[PDB]
């Protein structure tokens, strides 16, 4: 029984899911799991899945052990600029989907540098010349965090899926119901019940020019996004 659902990892979420509701049993073969595939090399959702399930849990002696055999998650937290991502890790491994959206935030005003740290908010041109790397670190959190169902590159996806066109794209990720925006910070959904794509935030107070600049950078093909 526990044997196949093993095999089944390699559809993979169903098997992660029974898994975790069958004792020690399941959960050690998960675990066991982890330490097959951890530190990631590439983003791989079911390792992400895999991870969160078991922190899901609650269970002291699960939490313990994935925090101290992965302290910090299970994607190496690169940067080009040296920055620190490990608080946006240990929000988004708590499933506090709305401190991670606050520190996705300053941490994008960190990239950019001491003027937008200052202003603390973006300029279009900052975005275009963002590094790669760290918008990928950034993303791939998000979205193994969050069973896919966050992140800029699933917002660029819908995009994409709606012609570029970014009035289309606001209802499906749920930043506008009809003609009203939804209001921040009450009017968003801090869990995975929001629709595909409602986060990261991207505040429109100041037009689309950063969102576009965002969606348009080179990591996302660079990356396999």
């Given at each position: 029984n526990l044997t196949e659902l093993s095999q089944q990892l390699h559809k993979q979420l169903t098997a992660i899911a029974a898994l975790a509701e069958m004792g020690e049993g399941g959960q050690g073969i998960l675990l066991d799991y982890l330490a097959k595939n951890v530190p990631l090399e590439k983003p791989v959702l079911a390792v992400g899945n895999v991870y969160q399930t078991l922190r899901n849990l609650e269970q002291e002696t699960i939490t313990t052990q994935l925090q101290r055999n992965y302290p910090t998650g299970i994607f190496?937290?690169?940067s080009a600029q040296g920055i620190d991502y490990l608080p946006l890790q240990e929000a988004l491994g708590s499933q506090d989907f709305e401190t991670a959206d606050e520190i996705t935030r300053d941490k994008l005003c960190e990239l950019a540098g001491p003027?937008?740290?200052?202003?603390?908010?973006?300029?279009f041109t900052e975005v275009e010349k963002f590094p790669?790397?760290?918008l990928h670190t950034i993303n791939a959190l998000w979205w193994l965090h969050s069973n896919g169902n966050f992140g800029f590159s699933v917002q660029r996806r819908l995009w994409l899926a709606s012609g570029k066109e970014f009035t289309k794209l606001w209802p499906k990720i749920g930043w506008k119901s009809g003609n009203v925006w939804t209001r921040w910070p009450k009017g968003f959904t801090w869990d995975l019940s929001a629709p595909q794509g409602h986060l990261p935030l991207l505040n429109q107070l100041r037009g689309v020019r950063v969102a576009e600049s965002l969606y348009r950078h080179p990591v996302w093909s660079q990356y396999g996004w």
């Open positions: 190496p937290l690169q003027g937008a740290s200052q202003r603390q908010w973006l300029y790669a790397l760290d």
